[PDB]
Swiss-Prot record, chain A:
It is found in: Host cytoplasm; Host Golgi apparatus. The chain holds residues 3241 to 3544 of 7073 of the full protein. This is 3C-like proteinase nsp5. It comes from Severe acute respiratory syndrome coronavirus (SARS-CoV). It catalyses: TSAVLQ-|-SGFRK-NH2 and SGVTFQ-|-GKFKK the two peptides corresponding to the two self-cleavage sites of the SARS 3C-like proteinase are the two most reactive peptide substrates. The enzyme exhibits a strong preference for substrates containing Gln at P1 position and Leu at P2 position. Residues 1-304 are cytoplasmic. Residues 1-304 form the Peptidase C30 domain. Cleaves the C-terminus of replicase polyprotein at 11 sites. Recognizes substrates containing the core sequence [ILMVF]-Q-|-[SGACN]. May cleave human NLRP1 in lung epithelial cells, thereby activating the NLRP1 inflammasome pathway. Also able to bind an ADP-ribose-1''-phosphate (ADRP). May cleave host ATP6V1G1 thereby modifying host vacuoles intracellular pH. Monomer. Homodimer. Only the homodimer shows catalytic activity. The active site is at H41, C145. Signal peptide: none annotated.
């Protein structure tokens, strides 16, 4: 085997995607049981985004204002409401394809799979990470709002992201499935922009462990470093400060390889200060930061 | 905006994955209608793989020598035959989840999605390219044999690859859904090794166009080049020779961006000679060749 960035199989989420139309505005909605969740801004025109009064805008709306379509079938909306930045449409049919699921709010650095959708039709799936600056570097075109991000564990789909907008830098912002935005972003037009971003140290470290697991270990050394000394270095390279909590999160990988985290940090320190000298790690020339400690375990163990 | 190495949604394929066992060997099979397709080497023993005669090994088997399972449920095998390097097992029930599909043989340089499976259960999906040398760089652990590669057009699944083995360098080899190997590889333990490979020039150019569409043009220049002079340079860096057909394929992206194909070639020529100088393109520090012109057009805005 080799080591590739992988997305979770997307079947369980494909079965939950529908198209939600309100006037001339169409986007994607997630259908679980008899509820369809979508970005509340589906009830907005152009000039509306410039600080719309969603409360007021919603009143002017009625169940028939919403056109929900699953496959080539219209789902009759029998109720509607707002939950933070999401619209909750009650429909007359419980999704027969509803998987076991839960809604979770992901933390910065964590990864998930995104099912890009258009007109309620899945078009592609990719793995990405919630950046330390609370945005995601995704790939979305107009009409992708409502697309969701998720993780799967056994048979349970953990929904963690719903797409709402693109920022001036071309990165993305969205909410958890309770409608609460990740970061300080809002669903209206403002001068809002992504703050400065950093490299996800925890993930880089997890990735170095995966490399060692796969026999790529030329970068290892016989030294170690203190947490504080590691951070004086990492931060110079725009790496996120490493916490004792991150150290503990890496415990299982540290135990599997018998390489203490601070010993691996000493290796990382050397790599940042001197580069790779033309060599590669897992066939890469750069330090990857979109694999969590959990991702490496999952993959380096063939979890299905 | 943004650009990711994305795969096709795998749902339509997940509903076709099953487990096939024969003796002590288990691997994945693809269940369509009333037929299950899998690598013929499922019938082989440890020694058998050193110099197996498949016709001779299969004649000694019967329908009941095969254990096909859809999840926890056994599918009764009521027929079996060999087609090139694949085993075709007829089962007594039809797969209600069978999508619209077709079997296609892909050309080197083209891309496809792979649904990595183990014991007939989906593990993950990733996008990759058939290298010019016919191998794929795909991360396949012991037991992934039988996993398939595919592309999806509308609602039609075009299956193009079935995983068979791993080569000494760690890259992978397989067949199309008719059981014909991509490359000169054979299904048995031997000295075979992946051949010389090249960077897929057409794809790198497609990617550079993607970079421009996403509003990034630092690598562009005021130069142009002839196809000939470009190949004289690219080939020095282990790039596949570029043909006029390739140039023509890039026509639409060329038109969309206003950048002439030969002009983009000049940019690429400069990048190969000068390197990136600490800069990146679409967040990458190296030139990527796993996105075809079709992929770029599909993922990028119009």
């Amino acid at each position: 085997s080799g080591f590739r960035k992988m997305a979770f199989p997307s079947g369980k989420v494909e079965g939950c995607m529908v198209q939600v139309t309100c006037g001339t505005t169409t986007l994607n909605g997630l259908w679980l049981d008899d509820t369809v969740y979508c970005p509340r801004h589906v009830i907005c025109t152009a000039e509306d985004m410039l600080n719309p009064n969603y409360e007021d805008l919603l009143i002017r709306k009625s169940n028939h204002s919403f056109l929900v379509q699953a496959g080539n079938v219209q789902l009759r909306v029998i109720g509607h409401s707002m939950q933070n930045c999401l619209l909750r449409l009650k429909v007359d049919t419980s999704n027969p394809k509803t998987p076991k699921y839960k809604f979770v709010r992901i933390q910065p650095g964590q990864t998930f799979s995104v099912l890009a959708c258009y007109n309620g039709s899945p078009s592609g799936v990719y793995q990405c990470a919630m950046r330390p600056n609370h945005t995601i570097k995704g790939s979305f075109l107009n009409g992708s709002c409502g697309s969701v991000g998720f993780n799967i564990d056994y048979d349970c789909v953990s929904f963690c992201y719903m797409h709402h907008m693109e920022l001036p830098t071309g990165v993305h912002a969205g909410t958890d499935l309770e409608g609460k935005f990740y970061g300080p972003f809002v669903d209206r037009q403002t001068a809002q922009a992504a703050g400065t971003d950093t490299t996800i140290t925890l993930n880089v470290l997890a990735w170095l462990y995966a490399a060692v697991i796969n026999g790529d270990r030329w970068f290892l050394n016989r030294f170690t470093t203190t947490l504080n000394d590691f951070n004086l270095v990492a931060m110079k390279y725009n790496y996120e400060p490493l916490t004792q909590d991150h150290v503990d999160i890496l415990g299982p990988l540290s135990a599997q390889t018998g390489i203490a985290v601070l010993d691996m940090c000493a290796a990382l320190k050397e790599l940042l200060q001197n580069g790779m000298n033309g060599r590669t790690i897992l066939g890469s020339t750069i330090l990857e930061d979109e694999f969590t400690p959990f991702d490496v375990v999952r993959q380096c163990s063939g979890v299905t």
